[PDB]
A paper describes a structure:
Cytochrome P450 3A7 (CYP3A7) is a fetal/neonatal liver enzyme that participates in estriol synthesis, clearance of all-trans retinoic acid, and xenobiotic metabolism. Compared to the closely related major drug-metabolizing enzyme in adult liver, CYP3A4, the ligand binding and catalytic capacity of CYP3A7 are substantially reduced. Despite high sequence similarity (~93%) and overlapping substrate specificity with CYP3A4, fetal-specific CYP3A7 has a significantly lower catalytic ability and generates an altered regioselectivity profile. Comparative analysis of CYP3A enzymes shows that decreased structural plasticity rather than the active site microenvironment defines the ligand binding ability of CYP3A7.
Since the wild type (WT) CYP3A7 resists crystallization, site-directed mutagenesis of surface residues was conducted to find a variant that promotes crystal growth. One such variant, R69G/C77G/K244E/K421A/K422A/K424A (CYP3A7mut), was produced, and its 2.15 Å dithiothreitol-bound structure was solved, providing the first insights into the molecular architecture and enabling comparative analysis of CYP3A enzymes. CYP3A7mut crystallized in space group C222, with two well-defined molecules per asymmetric unit. A bulk of positive electron density above the heme was seen in both molecules of CYP3A7, indicating association of a small polar ligand. Among components of purification and crystallization solutions, only dithiothreitol (DTT) could fit well into the density. The DTT ligand is held in place via water-mediated H-bonds that, on one side, link the hydroxyl group to the main chain atoms of R372 and D374 and the heme propionate and, on the opposite side, connect the thiolate sulfur to the iron and the A305 carbonyl. In DTT-bound CYP3A7, F304 adopts the upward conformation, and its phenyl ring is stacked in a hydrophobic cavity formed by L210, L211, F213, and F241. Thus, the conformational switch in F304 is likely triggered by the distinct fold/composition of the F-G fragment rather than association of DTT. In CYP3A7, D174 is replaced with histidine and H-bonds with E163, which immobilizes the helical core relative to CYP3A4. In other words, based on spectral, functional, and structural data, we suggest that the lower flexibility and inability of CYP3A7 to change the shape of the active site to optimize substrate binding and allow spin transitions is the primary reason for the diminished catalytic activity and distinct stereo/regioselectivity profiles.
Author numbering:
A (entry chain A): 25 to 262, 269 to 280, 286 to 497
B (entry chain B): 25 to 262, 268 to 280, 284 to 497
Write the structure that this text describes.
């Protein structure tokens, strides 16, 4: 059985590495998606095929073909991401929903994510930057090297859990909060636990598992979180994501109470580790590039002198900080790849793609490709200067994806990271210490991970 | 899921090759079980551990340990073979049955395999020797090379199908016989078709399949064969083959009789157990005679002494062919066509100083132990004299196991040895064998459920006088 699809790419003449029975090419992933994808690009060229168990995946690098997949043919042919598999009510989560159901949910949610509602949301979220400074100061004053994940992760989880669930939380300075302990538990679910990695090898189990109400999600942890958010909703009727969705419940039928909870949960899964990782990578680049850090601090000092609290409108003016964030995301696109399932046979941009193949856009490869970037391993924020905008193809540079199924939280994530970076750089200056892994090494994971934690030394300003 | 047992040999201090998720070490078998077992013996020592999918298998080479597994702790701990998996009524076949069910059917079949009953069966079986000679004469007389499998396969099938189903068949000279075509279709099933090899990667599917009455065997053929045997059973009601002996047994002692359905299952399993084994060994024996002309001559000399002037072989005369027994035994040493024995460990135990956990399969590498210089002098040389009476105490019966050992050993051993001798006598009374341009020397083996040759064995056969 373990070989039935393994002839597909050879029959179509798409190059690729030879798959093993049952495993496909999965063992080759374990050195990291980013290195495996690049190796395939270097040796097979513009297009290649691989197998993740029995699932074939076609890699594409042509920006015209990528626009066709991500944009033009999104609703018709390439509408859904790969299942993973047995879920329950989390079928309603915007990132898991498919076809017409996804379209309704993305539509219901678009009001919640406008820049206008974001601007209204900032004053409640600037508060969490104060906790970050408190947490960082407590770690950095002892003279010790700081583990960036500890404080930036706490900031990421505090901000996204608070606005998604409607509950101010402080994970470090109040770890006994049930919400902290439970949300922490929730976040233990990784798409790389041995349950998911077995479903990929025999995906025919999902129908049986769903017939038995088995889910890959922590059923108990979600049961408590739902039963707790129920009480908040009933008390609140006597500007976070929870309120915005509540307000939208009165073309598409409004969100059900169950559909809303699925959104709140998926926001945390989507926002926690991405934002945490990217914040750490940004500070790492700043530490290893003093004069870039110096120029960020000068600019912050210009718009927000004397540790003035950041606002939407002021953060919106940190154009250089924007370039620094954009250049960090080129080097470390934490999702690595984009994926779409082909719903039917098509020929696009000179290539036939059979039904059921997963199209894969290797963002990391395109971000690091010398064809599109000079010295692509160099951290040069100037690539994202206003004047170099014509030379950046939005199908080559895709840290938040593209098209109708892109990151719906991109604008919130950028502002949120700038709010935190401002606070922290208003008060501190980062520098490599003894334990800092330089150059940084990456490690296998669902997202871009570091081999060893990023440790720097943080010095107070004045 | 794909590694759930893969730490087990590490955790026990037992060495072995690093297994892959889901597959275990299975990709390494495809070069041949015999060559894989020997490689593991060389580089890992007396004991080693492998994984066939999720199933851990422990190889042992110590005769004392082998004798604990095969003999002492057989009914208590090492009772059953590995399943393969979904089977229907064939659960009653002796080789597949387990625990008290196996103990029952093996006891009901013991009367049928006594040497007395064997002797009463030879007058009926010697006939297929004449058919064998006729088929060989037709191929050999043109002076062409003869493909040993073609006549020896036919003989083995004719013999085992005739005595198991109770009809005389002649596969070559009457190939449109419906029994021939169906038995040939039945034997198409091999323990290596991809269905049984996917069940090994996910064994939890077997209960599902059995709930759906799905079977790994060809239900098609077994249906027609059962209906055919039933008509035969009524004609006899108004006579010494395996069918009769199991019918007669149907007439309590320590166990209830065989049901008609249990009887059919044994007839089917007899053909699976005896067809390809008997064919391959007969060809290996003729290959050794052709490549060792003196041994052939000495064998013929003994045959002419006991059965002068082409006298037909009988049970009492074939019993007198002491040197022919040496040849057969030496051939089976070089070519133990089963390669290995296996037993499932029913429960935790510690035998001769080694702990073995529940659910492991213990494996005895017969082929490894037959070619092991630790126990044989020049083990690659074909020397029939290791089995002379003067050298009886030099043959450890847990090192030399072409028929297995203990209560779960090959119940057809004695029939097999006599059946082969009946065949070799007729053939060696009428022909001498010689290598030709196409005889692969030395013989190259190939991967399979039994020991197979790379290329078919092809020899020249000259008639005597
Ligand atoms: C730096 C932080 C983040 C990064 C780098 C990131 C990256 C991505 C990427 C690459 C995708 C796939 C888009 C595609 O396939 O085209 C995605 C999807 C998504 N992200 Fe983000 N994300 C981040 C933060 C967030 C936040 C804060 C939220 C919510 C508040 C969020 C919610 C989502 C959702 C719901 C989807 C699925 C969209 C859909 O299927 O309609 N993400 N993200
Ligand atoms: C050259 C011929 C043959 C060889 C080399 C051979 C070899 C073997 C071996 C190695 C075993 C496994 C024993 C163990 O696991 O300890 C076995 C089992 C068996 N053989 Fe034979 N065999 C031959 C012919 C036959 C014939 C002709 C029959 C039937 C008349 C037969 C019936 C069986 C049965 C029923 C079993 C399973 C018995 C049980 O599990 O209790 N075999 N054979």
């Amino acid at each position: 059985y373990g070989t039935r699809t393994h002839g597909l790419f050879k029959k179509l003449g798409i190059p690729g590495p030879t798959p093993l029975p049952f495993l496909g090419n999965a063992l080759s992933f374990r050195k990291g998606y980013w290195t495996f994808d690049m190796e395939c690009y270097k040796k097979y060229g513009k297009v290649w095929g691989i197998y993740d168990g029995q699932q074939p995946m076609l890699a594409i690098t042509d920006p015209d073909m990528i626009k066709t997949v991500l944009v033009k043919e999104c609703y018709s042919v390439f509408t859904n991401r790969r299942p993973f598999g047995p879920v329950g009510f989390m079928k309603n989560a915007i990132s898991i929903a498919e076809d017409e159901e996804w379209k309704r949910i993305r539509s219901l949610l678009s009001p919640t994510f406008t820049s206008g509602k974001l601007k209204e949301m900032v004053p409640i979220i600037a508060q969490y930057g104060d906790v970050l400074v408190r947490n960082l100061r407590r770690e950095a004053e002892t003279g010790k090297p700081v583990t960036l994940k500890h404080v930036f992760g706490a900031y990421s989880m505090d901000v996204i859990t608070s606005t998604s669930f409607g509950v101010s939380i402080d994970s470090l300075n109040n770890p006994q909060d049930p919400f902290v302990e439970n949300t922490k538990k929730l976040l233990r679910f990784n798409p790389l636990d041995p349950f998911v990695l077995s479903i990929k090898v025999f995906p025919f189990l999902t129908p049986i598992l769903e017939a038995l109400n088995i889910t890959v999600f922590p059923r108990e942890v979600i049961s408590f979180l739902t039963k707790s958010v129920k009480q908040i909703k009933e008390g609140r009727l006597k500007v976070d994501f929870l309120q915005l969705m509540i307000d939208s419940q009165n073309t598409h039928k409004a969100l059900s109470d169950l559909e809303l909870m699925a959104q709140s949960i998926i926001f945390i899964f989507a926002g926690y580790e991405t934002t945490s990782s990217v914040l750490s990578f940004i500070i790492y680049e700043l530490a290893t590039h003093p004069d870039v850090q110096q120029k960020v601090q000068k600019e912050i000092d210009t718009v927000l002198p004397n540790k003035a609290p950041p606002t939407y409108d002021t953060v919106l003016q940190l154009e250089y900080l924007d370039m620094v964030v954009n250049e960090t995301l080129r080097l470390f696109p934490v999702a690595m790849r984009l994926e779409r399932v082909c719903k039917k046979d098509v020929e696009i941009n000179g290539m036939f793609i059979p039904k059921g193949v997963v199209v894969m856009i290797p963002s990391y490869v395109l971000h690091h490709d010398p064809k599109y970037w000079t010295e692509p391993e160099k951290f040069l924020p100037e690539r994202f200067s206003a004047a170099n905008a014509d030379n950046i193809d939005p199908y080559i540079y895709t840290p938040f994806g593209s098209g109708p199924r892109n990151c719906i939280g991109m604008r919130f994530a950028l502002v949120n990271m700038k709010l935190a970076l401002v606070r922290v750089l208003q008060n501190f200056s980062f520098k490599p210490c003894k334990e800092t892994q330089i150059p940084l090494k990456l490690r296998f994971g669902g997202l871009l991970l570091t081999e060893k934690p990023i440790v720097l030394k943080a010095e107070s300003r004045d």
